[PDB]
Amino acid sequence: NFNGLTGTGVLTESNKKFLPFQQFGRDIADTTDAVRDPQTLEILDITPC
């Protein structure tokens, strides 16, 4: 759960180069793919079960 982004899946280390004005990532489904932690500033990766 990240600021109202309820879901289900594994969380793993990511190496995507987000920009300072970017916060979310997406594949071609209009579905969230990568999220950024609110408290710490580091990019996570979301993969289904």
Binding site: T6, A29, T31
Partner: protein, 48 residues
Amino acid sequence: KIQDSLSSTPSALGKLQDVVNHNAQALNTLVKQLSSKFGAISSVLNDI
């Protein structure tokens, strides 16, 4: 000369390629259709 004709012309095997090409874009459209709102607030069930 059959081998030479096959190795020279790059479109001889066109009938077989269409069979596998038509079975990929169908799935591609079926998975791209998931981004349509269908006249709703959003396309994400969790958001709704």
